[PDB]
Write a protein that binds this DNA or RNA. Structure first.
Ligand code: MG
Ligand code: ZN
Ligand code: ZN
Ligand code: ZN
Lengths: 98, 93, 84, 549, 171, 105, 268, 174
RNA sequence: GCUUGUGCUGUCUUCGUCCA
């Protein structure tokens, strides 16, 4: 798993709009199946069958989740888009021009 | 830390800073070389404490070097093309 | 053979800036590795400052070996090289 | 101290001896023989032994140890394997030299066409440099077009007429003037024929030709056994979460091995010469393009995507090649980059560093009895509070991360440990702007930690850097040792660089509105009242506390 | 066989020992690290001659690590067995697979296949021995054996002896 | 050659110290003939193969060195840079030894 | 091309092969940062001005040192040995003038970069020792002559007693010795600068120390410095000129764009 | 660990049969060749040591070190205990036990006379030092026995082997 | 006593930023 936090995800693996996010947080939760190992020996169903493929927020960016879009691609599979919003106030080093 | 920065550091005369930039702050690596064939063919097993060069059949005349990993890769790619760069730790004249 | 006798040393009798920098760095590293200090320290704590204080008093226990182009060398003590 | 202990003595390279690899040496240094073209055993992990991904060649997986040395991924250098060629092939990099050597010697008796009896030949042999010696010997023996079975007394020759050799791609044509005009025959000079001719060259003739008996023997220019590089040289890449991609070198080696298998199968079963020629020429092409894919005069080897194959030669040349892009200049750690700004209230040799950059970068300070108290305070403060620390390094080399330590207050520092403390004030750092045209483009400043996210410079140093504050960015490099810190503070420091050796004049002066204001302020009719004079005098750091009359 | 050899050692010294007693400390460090060691190339180093007057020269400061490196040259007594050499020995153990003898610091194992057949191993004897009508070789018995093979280890040497030829066996 | 170089540099009023141009024109004419500052001039010297291959014609130089069994003495600065060693320049142009005589105090 | 060139401990400038590029860096062994434009005073001016400035006559009263500047003006006139010393000094000055005017600088340019600024040293001495006031100096002429003569033999660029070493050492400081003798002449010291004794030894010691400080340091990578110093102006810049001409020069092109000759005709 | 004064020995192509260790063939390898070099690089001969000479040298050196460590103020057990290192102590104990239990000559003058006889002899001027050490060590009694034990002496038939053996037996303390 | 979670391709192409 990614070192970020998964606690902001909903039941369907998608974050909800209006939630403040920080760098490395997980905004899309996705897993890919993996052939199980011999852990079925004595593991009480607690054996790894899936591998994480989640999408984390960029490390240097943070903001508010603005709008989450869920639809189907041309192939009929699920397809999501997450838009993040933040405000940038001028500060020392910002470039201006006439 | 491109070539022009390397030339500026040469002009300043700071050899230690240049060595540290290109080794410690970057790809530093340790290899073992046979003291006879001069190739990086020593099969070193650190935990068992035994070194051995099969081609020369020796167990003693073996040294270790600290070289950039890119240099090791370059020498291995040269060996892939039938060119043998032999590294020796003593001069001969 | 390769060593040059003290009477026939012909290199400059001054500490060049490269030699000064290298000597200060080596002495600072050695002090930071708990080497004995040959001068009294009033309130100084920086290894580089202690090394500079040692150098000013000609108390650094190091030897410069200057390599001539042909391979011969001259050994100069840091206590006998003039420092500006 | 970052490397696990090894009892072998540590020395430094003093000489690099070049040469060719004999087939005996290739077989000796190898650890496995590569013969099966299939990369994977049954697509069920555990790559096939004896294949291109044999576990004995080395390990590139974290949980898999090398079966030859037993070391981990971080320590295994990779081990070579060898592949036996069914028929010898030319080395693509030595074909012109092979042609020259064929012109210099006789193709039957394997002896030089000229002897020391000729004064010019003896004069040429007298020279020392192997390349110039070979050039002179070739210039002389090129004209001699017939072997002499008798002295020009027997000189050891066979008396046969020497053919004229012409190059055509990877094939060499030898034309004999068989016996005014008659019918001459030009026949192909196969690599095997040239190889068995070269093996009969005497060591003295080999030395006369510029080759070295011990290190560069002429017949080693023909490839009879191929060394297979370890997977470290040709790593695989995971294109997506499921399918990984074989490297270009791996595919080329698979093609070469398939061609070798095809030649071996064809030879033992049935031998139409046309088929043999076609298949052996295919093998020669594959081996040649595996090492050089820019051979002028013939089409390049292409991938299934249509892109040309990245041969080993292409790996070493250009700006992005090995030498220019990874050895002469490489990416480095402990560095920062951000926009620069101006600060009139900074000394000449001071740079303003943001707090976040100061927290990210670090300097390993050795714990002694002069700073153990301060370093313990830094360790307590942790990696988020300035001044703080990021790691504690023990004598054995183990790193203690202070982010993930629940008992940071329960850490006692012993002498000789290192604390990777935060960047602090008056730390010398190297500061640089590209392009670095001259040596004043890299100078060492003293750190001053400041808020906001830009590097800050005194405006007098904007001239040597050729920098202004309209968006320029500059690079900062942190020394990581006492020796390197001393070198920076004693050699590259800004005050030492005021006068340049290019024109023995200063490179820094008063600039911009300071220059305008010192012209306006020093006019003859500028008078200043007492209350403003007091403020102006207090602003001078070096003022001695006496007001002038 | 014992020999006199001129050997050299590379000694690295930590800066914490940079004191007036540096030379003597290097001398005792050399003595502790050489006396009694076993190198396959040379054999066994038993003593160092003139151990208190060994020249150490001037140590070179390793760039980037502070420690000084010293090159110490000395003359030492070295013992090394050779293939096909006949030497005296004292039996240290008796076992059905063969008997173990000691030649100085070297321990030599002789298998039954290299022992004359008449010297049948007697386990009932006290102590058990390989005995014949006129010969009886047990623990502590002097034996003259010929070294046939030597095995090189990390810091150990294993030799194999034989008594199957003439002028061998019990002495 | 010095006169021509100075004429080129000083046309726009710029000034470069004499010793730099003197060094350049002494390098260009040190072999008895004009040595152009190109691969055909620099790479035709007797310097180490590793130093020469770092400028231009890397692979060809490496093959020529291998076939001729060239020996590189690792005295240059490029050789020591690409091997991660202390170059014999600046602060690396000498050695520091430990003064067992002075430590007796 | 110039990377592997470095000043060695014997003063020579060698590449990595050990081949000599120069027998002395910059032909004087000095560092590029320790030189300044100075005027050599024996070059310019007519013969009458040179004679008036430098000649001292102890027989003619009105052509001698002024009596108010020296305490010992009474027992100077009529001395013959001191006149011999002064004549030797003047002959040395005339030889320097001839050497500079006929060999080194034929066009008469006298403003050249030279080490240790003499004017700054002299005015520092004047400020330090309060050399104002009409007070008479106590500095005897033989002290001046012998002090300057001895100073011109302590400017060590090369150490050693070898004869060839001594010849090279003498060659390396010819221009600087000419400058020093031009400035520290007897008449100029006694009249123009009005130094006393203590100022004189201070000036001599300062000159020697500054010259020792202005030498080049073994271990300089002068090749890279020269390459950077030549390439830096090129980034900021009928015959061909500019970058194309520099490219023609460096490549040693056989057929340049605008070949030309400069034919000089005979005097008539 | 310790490095011999002989260095270099780089790669070649020829292989020789005089590389393998063999006492009978007197092939002792490069590091034990007949010609050696000292710290000054001058010519030096291989220095073999018989058990008598080895015992004398080890006893002298050990007692000198013991005297030096006590400020310059005989028992083998105490002498072994003088050295430092438990493994070193055991090794020197074993060597001392071997030398004592097989010492043919425990007297300095007897060993000196034996060495003089084995060196200054005209026949022994060709004898290899290894052969001399073996002769003085094994204490052989017969020409046939010595030849069987030392195959090298078989090819050297210009040696007064029997009378030299009798001289050694006489010098041997009964 | 229920005990915490460490890992990222690669190759092209284009468009930009600061010098020049
Ligand atoms: Mg700008
Ligand atoms: Zn080897
Ligand atoms: Zn491995
Ligand atoms: Zn022929």
């Amino acid at each position: 798993l990614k070192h970020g936090t998964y606690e902001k995800l909903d039941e369907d693996g998608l974050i909800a709009p209006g939630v403040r996010v920080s760098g490395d947080d997980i905004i899309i939760g996705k897993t890919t199946p993996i052939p199980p190992d011999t852990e079925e020996l004595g593991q009480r169903t607690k054996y790894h069958t899936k591998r994480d493929a989640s999408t984390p927020l960029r490390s240097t960016e943070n903001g508010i989740v603005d709008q989450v879009l869920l639809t189907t691609n041309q192939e009929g599979l699920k397809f999501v888009k997450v838009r993040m919003r933040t405000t940038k106030v001028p500060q020392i080093g910002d470039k201006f021009a006439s | 830390f491109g070539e022009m920065e390397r030339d500026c550091m040469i002009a300043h005369g700071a050899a230690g800073f240049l060595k540290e930039r290109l080794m410690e702050a970057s790809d530093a690596f340790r290899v073992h070389v046979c003291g006879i064939c001069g190739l990086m063919s020593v099969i070193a097993n650190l935990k068992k404490n035994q070194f051995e060069c099969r081609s020369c059949k020796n167990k003693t005349n073996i040294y270790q070097l600290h070289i950039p990993y890119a240099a090791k890769l370059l020498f291995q790619e040269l060996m892939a093309m039938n060119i043998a760069p032999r590294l020796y730790t003593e001069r001969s004249g | 053979e390769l060593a040059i006798l003290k009477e026939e040393r012909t290199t400059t009798p001054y500490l060049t800036k490269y030699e000064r920098a290298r000597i200060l760095g080596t002495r600072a590293l050695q002090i930071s590795m708990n080497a004995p200090v040959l001068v009294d320290i009033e309130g100084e704590t920086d290894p580089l400052q202690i090394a500079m204080k040692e150098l000013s008093q000609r108390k650094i226990p190091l030897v410069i070996r200057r390599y001539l182009p042909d391979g011969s060398y001259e050994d100069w003590g840091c206590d006998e090289l003039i420092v500006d | 101290s970052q490397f696990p202990y090894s009892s072998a003595p540590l020395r430094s390279v003093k000489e690099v001896q070049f040469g060719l690899l004999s087939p005996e040496e290739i077989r000796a240094i190898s650890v496995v023989k590569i013969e099966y073209p299939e990369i994977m055993d049954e697509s069920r992990q555990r790559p096939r032994e004896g294949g291109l991904n044999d576990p004995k060649l080395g390990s590139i997986d974290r949980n898999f140890k090398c079966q030859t040395c037993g070391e981990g991924m971080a320590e295994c250098p990779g081990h070579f394997g060898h592949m036996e060629l069914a028929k010898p092939v030319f080395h693509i990099g030595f074909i012109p030299k092979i042609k020259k050597v064929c012109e210099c010697i006789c193709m039957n008796c394997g002896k030089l066409l000229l002897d020391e009896t000729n004064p010019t030949m003896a004069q040429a042999i007298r020279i020392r440099d192997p390349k110039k010696r070979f050039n002179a010997v070739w210039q002389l023996c090129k004209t001699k077009m017939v072997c002499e079975a008798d002295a020009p007394v027997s000189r050891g020759g066979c008396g046969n007429t020497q053919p004229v050799v012409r190059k055509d791609g990877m094939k060499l044509w030898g034309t004999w003037k068989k016996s005014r005009d008659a019918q001459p025959e030009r026949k192909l000079l196969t690599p095997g024929e040239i190889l068995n001719v070269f093996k009969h060259i005497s060591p003295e003739d080999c030395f006369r030709l510029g080759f070295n008996e011990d290190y560069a023997r002429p017949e080693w220019m023909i490839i009879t056994v191929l060394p297979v590089p370890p997977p470290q040289v040709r790593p695989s890449i995971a294109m997506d979460e499921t399918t990984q991609g074989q490297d270009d070198l791996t595919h080329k080696l698979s093609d070469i091995l398939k061609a070798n298998i095809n030649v071996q199968k064809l030879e033992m079963d049935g031998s139409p010469q046309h088929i043999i020629n076609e298949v052996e020429q295919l093998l020669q092409f594959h081996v040649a393009t595996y090492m050089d894919n820019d051979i002028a005069g013939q089409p390049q080897a292409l991938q299934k995507s249509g892109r040309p194959v990245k041969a080993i030669r292409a790996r070493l040349k250009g700006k992005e090649g090995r030498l220019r892009g990874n050895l002469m200049g490489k990416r480095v750690d402990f560095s920062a980059r951000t926009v620069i700004s101006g600060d009139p209230n900074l000394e000449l040799d001071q740079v303003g560093v943001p707090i976040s950059i100061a927290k990210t970068l670090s300097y390993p300070e050795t714990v002694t009895q002069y700073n153990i108290h301060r370093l313990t305070e830094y360790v307590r403060n942790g990696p988020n509070e300035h001044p703080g620390a990021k790691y504690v390094i023990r004598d054995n080399g183990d790193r203690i991360d202070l982010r993930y330590h629940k008992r940071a207050g329960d850490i006692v520092l012993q002498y000789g440990w290192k604390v990777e403390r935060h960047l602090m004030d008056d730390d010398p750092v190297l500061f640089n702007r590209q392009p670095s045209l001259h040596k004043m483009s890299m100078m060492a400043h003293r750190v001053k930690v400041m808020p906001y996210s830009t590097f800050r410079l005194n405006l007098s140093v904007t001239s040597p850097y050729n920098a202004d504050f309209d968006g320029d960015e500059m690079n900062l490099h942190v020394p990581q040792s006492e020796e390197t810190r001393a070198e920076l503070s004693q050699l590259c420091a800004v005050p030492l660089q005021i006068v340049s050796p290019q024109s023995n004049k200063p490179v820094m002066g008063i600039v911009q509105d300071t220059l305008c204001g010192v012209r306006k302020m020093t006019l003859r009719d500028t008078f200043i009242e007492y209350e403003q004079v007091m403020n102006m005098l207090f602003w001078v750091p070096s003022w001695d506390g006496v007001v002038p009359q | 066989m014992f020999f006199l050899k001129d050997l050299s050692l590379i000694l690295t010294l930590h800066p914490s020992y940079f004191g007036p007693q540096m030379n003597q400390y290097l001398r005792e460090k050399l003595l502790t690290d050489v006396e009694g060691t076993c190198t396959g190339q040379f054999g066994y180093i038993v003593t160092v001659l003139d151990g208190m007057n060994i020249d150490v020269g001037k140590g070179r400061i390793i760039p980037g690590s502070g420690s000084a490196e010293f090159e110490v040259k000395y003359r030492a007594v070295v013992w090394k067995p050779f293939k096909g050499e006949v030497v005296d020995a004292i039996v240290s153990n008796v076992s059905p697979i063969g008997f173990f003898a000691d030649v100085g610091p070297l321990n030599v194992f002789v298998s039954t296949r290299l022992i004359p057949d008449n010297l049948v191993y007697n386990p009932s004897n006290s102590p058990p021995a390989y005995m014949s009508n006129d010969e009886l070789i047990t623990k502590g018995s002097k034996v003259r054996l010929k070294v046939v093979g030597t095995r090189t280890d990390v810091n150990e040497i294993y030799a194999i002896g034989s008594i199957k030829e003439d002028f061998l066996g019990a002495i | 050659l010095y006169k021509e170089i100075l004429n080129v540099i000083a046309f726009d009023g710029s000034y470069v110290n004499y010793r730099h141009m003197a060094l350049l024109v002494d390098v260009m004419t040190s072999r008895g003939y004009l040595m152009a500052i190109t691969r055909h001039g620099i790479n035709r010297a007797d310097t180490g193969a590793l130093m020469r291959c770092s400028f231009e014609e890397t692979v060809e130089i490496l093959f020529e060195a291998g076939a001729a069994a060239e020996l590189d003495d690792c005295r240059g600065v490029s050789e020591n840079v690409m091997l991660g060693q202390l170059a014999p320049m600046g602060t690396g142009a000498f050695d520091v030894m430990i003064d067992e005589k002075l430590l007796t105090s | 091309a110039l990377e592997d060139i470095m000043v060695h401990y014997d003063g020579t400038t060698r590449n990595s092969l050990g081949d000599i590029i120069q027998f002395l860096y910059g032909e004087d062994g000095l560092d590029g940062t320790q030189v300044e434009r100075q005027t050599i005073d024996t070059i310019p001016g007519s013969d009458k001005a040179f004679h008036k400035r430098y000649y001292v006559d102890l027989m003619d009263e009105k052509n001698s040192i002024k009596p108010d500047v020296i305490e010992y003006a009474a027992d100077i006139l009529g001395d013959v040995e001191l006149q011999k010393e002064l004549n030797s000094e003047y002959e040395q000055l005339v030889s320097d003038r001839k050497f500079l005017r006929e060999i080194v600088f034929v066009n008469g340019d006298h403003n050249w970069p030279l080490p240790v600024n003499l004017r700054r040293i002299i005015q520092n001495a004047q400020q330090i020792f309060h050399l104002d006031r009409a007070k008479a100096s106590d500095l005897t002429i033989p002290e001046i002559i012998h002090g300057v003569r001895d100073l011109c033999k302590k400017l060590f660029v090369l150490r050693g007693e070898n004869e060839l070493i001594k010849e090279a050492q003498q060659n390396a400081t010819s221009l600087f010795q000419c400058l020093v003798r031009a400035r520290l002449a007897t008449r100029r010291i006694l009249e123009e600068f009005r130094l006393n004794r203590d100022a004189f030894e201070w000036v001599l010691g300062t000159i020697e120390a500054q010259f020792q400080r202005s030498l080049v340091h073994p271990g300089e990578m002068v090749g890279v410095i020269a390459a950077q110093s030549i390439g830096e102006p090129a980034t900021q810049m009928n015959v061909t000129l500019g970058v194309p001409r520099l490219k023609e020069i460096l490549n040693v092109a056989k057929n340049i764009k605008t070949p030309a000759l400069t034919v000089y005709l005979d005097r008539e | 660990v310790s490095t011999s004064t002989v260095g270099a020995r780089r790669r070649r192509a020829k292989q020789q049969v005089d590389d393998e260790e063999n006492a009978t063939l007197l092939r002792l390898g490069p590091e034990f060749a007949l010609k050696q070099y000292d710290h000054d690089g001058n010519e030096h001969d291989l220095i073999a040591l018989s058990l008598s000479e080895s015992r004398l040298l080890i006893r002298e050196a050990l007692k000198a070190r013991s005297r030096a460590r006590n400020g310059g103020v005989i028992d083998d057990d105490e002498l072994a205990k003088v050295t430092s290192g438990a493994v070193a102590n055991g090794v020197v104990k074993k060597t001392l036990d071997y030398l004592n239990t097989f010492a043919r000559f425990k007297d300095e003058e007897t060993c000196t006379a034996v060495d003089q006889l084995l060196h200054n002899s005209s026949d022994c001027s060709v004898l290899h030092p290894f052969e001399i050490a073996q002769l003085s060590s094994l204490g052989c009694e017969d020409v046939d026995e010595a030849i069987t034990l030392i195959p090298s002496l078989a090819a050297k038939k210009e040696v007064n082997l029997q009378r030299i053996l009798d001289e050694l037996n006489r010098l041997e303390d009964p």
